[PDB]
Amino acid sequence: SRKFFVGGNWKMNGRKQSLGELIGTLNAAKVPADTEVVCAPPTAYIDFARQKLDPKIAVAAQNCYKVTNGAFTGEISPGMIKDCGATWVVLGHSERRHVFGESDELIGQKVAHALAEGLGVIACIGEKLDEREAGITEKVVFEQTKVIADNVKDWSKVVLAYEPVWAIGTGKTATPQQAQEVHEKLRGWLKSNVSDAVAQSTRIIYGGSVTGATCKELASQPDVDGFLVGGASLKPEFVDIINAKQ
Amino acid sequence: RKFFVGGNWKMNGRKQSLGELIGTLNAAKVPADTEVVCAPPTAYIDFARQKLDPKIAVAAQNCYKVTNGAFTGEISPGMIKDCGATWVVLGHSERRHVFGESDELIGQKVAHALAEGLGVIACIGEKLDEREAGITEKVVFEQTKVIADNVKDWSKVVLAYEPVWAIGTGKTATPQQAQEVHEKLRGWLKSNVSDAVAQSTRIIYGGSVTGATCKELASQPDVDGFLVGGASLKPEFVDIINAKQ
């Protein structure tokens, strides 16, 4: 009773021709029954990607705003995302939080509006190195999860992605037992603060480093339900990561 | 100086509604002395470019400062070019004052956008507290300086003045007050770049413009066009395109 979830976050990479090639590789690749596959292209190519991608793979926006229409030059709404045939949005990504300064409050508002509009939400959380080494990993990720939880009225269309930001571009790495450790406490937070039904049914995916060689061990961790893949989502080894349960 | 009319659609529309607006614009006889540009939501750059007649150019509403990278939710000038858009709006009041984009970031975006071959619609202007404290000129000349520091070729740049102080504050700008700022901005270009750049650089008005008000604003001697807000989503945008006719 928890479907394996592999999301591919292309970030700000690619053009039509290069992403066409990427999409060609994904389409010919055989997706397992038990694996839910989601691709998040750059915002200019949500529409392009959805038209080229086989429908066995869902499309996600990388971000969105918190109202349906408005005076918000540079933003897109969940309504616009649905209109392009995309069914998900990535919210609270480490880069939005830490490069573009998006607050927990704002991320929460965005979650409420996305869910209300009928989109799925990949809600991202994670502690930085200085927070980890200060021994406050739990306080950070629980507070972040709390604000998301405060804006979720139905969890069936939510997926939680833990980003070990402390082990990203920093010369430090996360062992699979350290991934499992955090994932377990997050599911425990859901159990204690939301419900047992939500704790049991909610996918908690891992956003840290994953390769074709570490993906099987990571996937088999009991509280790891799949992946939000960065750089490797642009390469052929995304297919290995999709088949990490096989 | 060729008259410049930009329509900023902001975060509005879907394929249906924007399809019909695009039909309406496609039917419009654009005057030969007037350059027209539409800035759609980022999800619709590609869609709008395919539907829009080539007589109208397409602009992204924002971009980031590198070609490719780990910047979830951002797009680059390369992507904008790749979708067939030839402009980008940068430093819009909403980027500066709602999403916190600094002069440092905006200037860097301007340099990368221009290096990459896009035209830039570069947006400046002062809030009410700044205007009332008497520092209009300081604020807008400083914002213009950061832009100019990152400009080598002004042929690819349009300056947009946004009286942010007039936006839902209880104050509004008259065409005389618009002209005053524009004439000051052009003199800043004369003195700090060249007379040639001052003479040939379109300075466009980015405050409230409608079918009713565009003719008198257009006739101001230092006002070279508009970056249009809400009116750009409607047929009356065509009246604003016709401002100098």
Swiss-Prot record, chain B:
Catalytic activity entry: D-glyceraldehyde 3-phosphate = dihydroxyacetone phosphate; dihydroxyacetone phosphate = methylglyoxal + phosphate
Any GO BP: gluconeogenesis
Top-rank lineage group of the source organism: Eukaryota
GO cellular component: cytosol; extracellular exosome; extracellular space; nucleus
Modified positions (Phosphoserine) in chain numbering: 17, 76, 102, 155, 194, 208, 219
Record field: transmembrane: none
SUPFAM superfamilies: Triosephosphate isomerase (TIM)
Modified residues (3'-nitrotyrosine): 64, 205
Keyword Phosphoprotein: yes
Residue numbers annotated as active site: 92, 162
Associated disease: Triosephosphate isomerase deficiency: An autosomal recessive multisystem disorder characterized by congenital hemolytic anemia, progressive neuromuscular dysfunction, susceptibility to bacterial infection, and cardiomyopathy.
Family, as annotated: Belongs to the triosephosphate isomerase family.
Subunit record text: Homodimer.
Protein known as: Triosephosphate isomerase
Gene field: TPI1
